[PDB]
């Protein structure tokens, strides 16, 4: 029957789902200590499913409100909610914070039976580290001859509405339709799952320090839903609007929200367009249609910075104000401006898309034998393919990158060499030499204080470095460009100072 079973140590919640879903919440810690789906225990026995590594101690209450059950867990700076609806095999959750947890990240981890749930979806065993020997920190491993990491399960938050772990008789999915209180914008990615040897972890990283570009946000994180299936795959269309009737701290209902609608125009039509709204309280995003038409998600009232991207490259920024119950009409327009192009390597999309090893880097370590050679490589304009240009240059692996190009007599005037990047590590930035002319050494970029390129990430501050080339420095015939990564810092192989390329363009 739908309801709550009370004992001194626990509340047992029965969702009354057709294929059965019951779970046990500790009244001492708020740990989920047992999960019964279709007559089968799914919870790892030695450690609970919980926020972080566990709340430790919490004040736990459980109440039925019509066809809903709410479990509330109160600590000093965090309130954890679990909500179920009669008939649905779902544990709906939301996490209210007034301060960032001590550890400096905010996550929910489900530690589940890896014999019953061995697989990870949608990316497969790239994040399966079971039987692995560590090759970097405590988070990148070699399993046989293949490099593996929990980070290789990651996906851009804009595209991460569902990820799962699964077996032949059970599937458990996170359904994530509310990233408003997260950090780092639409293109932030984070740890999704990890079959690590003792159990298979299913995550939602609400926020973290992994390649983090923004301050953390307080208030209500989520809702988020953990769906339990036999062999079905749940739709991401899951109503959580009933949260409005449960006195959930920090919850703002549809009625307390407004929208921004309009048309974006002017950017590169060969790329997907994204519009992004943010302030200290909340962040929102949407893809536009091919015509540039967009409507924001339902937004908390206030004033927002508004950004228009082609791919992940920002072409325009504006400001907009949102009021509850109202749609603000606001257009946005912009384009990437350079000049008369001599050569262009890559595209202005804020990504290393198309570069050597770019596709592999999302799902394996740079040291993996399946990677193509990092270099040092010589790229020759008009002969080399884009997949012959390294997605990243490391001070102590493939430094420097050499570019050969042909110029006509008409192209010997003044020019700008533009070196667009996505993400730096350990102070890495380019210094360029063109023939016998050496550009200035740019200062160190802002340190993001985390690994990235070795953990399937690339979305940084997107620093762009221009080098002014005087007239008569470019010559008719063959020219040589050398791109060195410089930094006062040092490291072994892929942990040496480095940056990931976005685009390299020479224009006049
Ligand atoms: Ca690019």
Q: Where are the domains of the chain?
A: 1-251, 252-336, 337-508
Resolution, given in Å to one decimal, reads 1.9
For ligand 1, the distance from its centroid to the CA atom of residue 338, given in whole angstroms, is 15
Q: How far is CA 56 from CA 23, 48, 206, 220, in A?
A: 19, 11, 19, 20
Contacts of residue 106, Cβ cutoff 8 Å, sequence gap at least 6: 51, 52, 95, 97, 100, 205, 206, 207, 208, 216, 221
Domain 252-336, CATH 3.30.1300.10 — does that match? Answer: no
Architecture of domain 1-251: Distorted Sandwich (2.70)
For ligand 1, the distance from its centroid to the CA atom of residue 502, given in whole angstroms, is 4
Report CA Rg, the chain. 25
For ligand 1, the distance from its centroid to the CA atom of residue 486, given in whole angstroms, is 21
Pairing assessment for the beta strands 378-380 and 401-407 based on DSSP bridges? parallel
At residue 382's C-alpha, the angle toward residues 354 and 419, to 5°, is 55
d(CA 105, CA 96): 14
For ligand 1, the distance from its centroid to the CA atom of residue 211, given in whole angstroms, is 18
For ligand 1, the distance from its centroid to the CA atom of residue 503, given in whole angstroms, is 5
Pairing assessment for the beta strands 90-97 and 78-85 based on DSSP bridges? antiparallel
d(CA 503, CA 344): 7
d(CA 301, CA 202): 33
Peptide bond into 122 cis (omega under 30): yes
Domain 337-508, CATH 3.30.70.260 — does that match? Answer: no
437 burial level (CB within 10 Å; 0-12, 13-18, 19+): middle
d(CA 103, CA 394): 30
Whether 337-508 and 1-251 are alike in CATH topology: the answer is no
d(CA 339, CA 482): 22
Show the beta-strand stretches assigned E in 352-474.
378-380, 392-394, 401-407, 415-425, 429-434, 437-438, 464-469
Q: Are 225 and 95 in contact (CB under 8 A)?
A: no
Show the beta-strand stretches assigned E in 267-414.
273-278, 283-287, 293-295, 302-310, 313-322, 327-329, 332-333, 341-346, 378-380, 392-394, 401-407
Show the beta-strand stretches assigned E in 356-493.
378-380, 392-394, 401-407, 415-425, 429-434, 437-438, 464-469, 477-486
| DSSP category for residue 127 | G
Q: Are 417 and 467 in contact (CB under 8 A)?
A: yes
d(CA 179, CA 193): 18
Among candidate residues 442, 415, 436, the one with its CA nearest the CA of residue 499: 442
What is the dihedral angle through the alpha carbons of 240, 103, 124, 47, rounded to the nearest 10 degrees?
Answer: -80
For 51-81, give one letter per residue: b (16+ CB within 10 A) or e: beebbeebebebeeeeebbbbbbebeebbbb
The residues that bridge with 489 in the sheet, in sequence order, are none
For ligand 1, the distance from its centroid to the CA atom of residue 296, given in whole angstroms, is 26
| Residue ranges with CB less than 5 Å from ion ligand 1 | 346-347, 349, 351, 502-503
d(CA 440, CA 51): 48
For ligand 1, the distance from its centroid to the CA atom of residue 421, given in whole angstroms, is 8
The experimental method, as deposited, was X-ray
Among candidate residues 451, 467, 440, the one with its CA nearest the CA of residue 500: 451
End-to-end CA distance of the chain: 74
Residue 92, by phi and psi: left (phi above 0), alpha (psi -120 to 50) or beta?
beta
For ligand 1, the distance from its centroid to the CA atom of residue 123, given in whole angstroms, is 23
């Amino acid at each position: 029957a739908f309801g709550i079973t009370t004992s001194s140590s626990a509340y047992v919640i029965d969702t009354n789902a057709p294929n059965q879903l019951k779970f046990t919440v500790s009244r001492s810690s708020c740990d989920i200590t047992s999960i019964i789906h279709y007559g089968t225990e799914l919870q790892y026995s030695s450690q609970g499913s919980h926020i972080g590594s566990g709340l430790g101690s919490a004040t736990v209450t459980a109440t039925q409100s019509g066809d809903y059950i709410k479990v509330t867990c109160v600590t000093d700076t965090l309130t954890q909610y679990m909500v179920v609806h009669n008939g649905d095999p779902i544990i709906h959750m939301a996490t209210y914070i007034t301060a960032e947890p001590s550890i400096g990240e905010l996550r929910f981890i489900a530690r589940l039976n890896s014999d019953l749930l061995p697989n990870e979806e949608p990316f497969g065993d790239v994040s399966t580290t079971a039987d692995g020997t560590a090759i970097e920190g405590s988070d990148v491993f070699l399993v046989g001859s293949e490099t593996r990491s929990k980070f290789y399960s990651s996906e851009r938050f804009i595209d991460d509405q569902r990820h799962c772990i699964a077996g032949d008789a059970h599937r458990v999915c996170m359904i994530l339709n509310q990233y408003e209180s997260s950090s780092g914008g639409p293109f932030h990615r984070d740890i999704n799952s990890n079959n690590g040897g003792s159990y298979n972890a299913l995550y939602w990283y609400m926020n973290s320090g992994a390649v983090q570009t923004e301050s953390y946000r307080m208030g209500l994180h989520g809702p988020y839903s953990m769906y339990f299936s036999r062999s079905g795959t749940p739709s991401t269309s899951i109503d959580t609007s009933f949260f409005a009737d449960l006195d959930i701290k920090g919850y703002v209902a549809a009625s307390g929200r407004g929208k921004v609608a309009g048309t974006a125009s002017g950017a590169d039509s060969s790329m997907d367009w994204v519009v992004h709204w943010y302030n200290d309280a909340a962040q929102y995003w949407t893809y536009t249609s091919s015509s540039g038409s967009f409507t924001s998600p339902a937004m908390k009232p206030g004033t927002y910075t508004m950004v228009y991207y082609q791919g992940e490259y920002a072409v325009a920024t504006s400001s907009v104000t949102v009021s509850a119950g109202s749609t603000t009409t606001k257009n946005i327009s912009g384009s990437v401006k350079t000049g008369t192009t001599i050569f262009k390597i890559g595209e202005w999309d804020g990504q290393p898309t198309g570069f050597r090893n770019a596709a592999n880097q999302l799902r394996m370590h740079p040291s993996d034998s399946r990677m193509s050679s990092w270099g040092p490589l010589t790229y020759t304009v008009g002969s080399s393919a884009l997949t012959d240009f390294p997605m990243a240059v490391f001070k102590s692996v493939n430094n420097p990158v050499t570019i050969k190009f042909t110029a006509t007599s008409a192209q010997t005037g003044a020019a700008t060499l533009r070196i667009g990047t996505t993400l730096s590590f350990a102070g890495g930035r380019p210094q360029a030499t063109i023939n016998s002319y050496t550009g200035s050494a740019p200062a160190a970029p802002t340190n993001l204080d985390s690994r990235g390129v070795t953990r399937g990430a690339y979305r940084g501050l997107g620093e762009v470095y221009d080098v002014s080339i005087p007239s008569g420095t470019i010559v008719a015939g063959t020219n040589t460009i050398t791109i060195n990564v410089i930094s006062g810092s040092s490291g072994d192989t892929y942990l040496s100072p480095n940056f990931i390329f976005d685009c390299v363009e020479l224009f006049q």
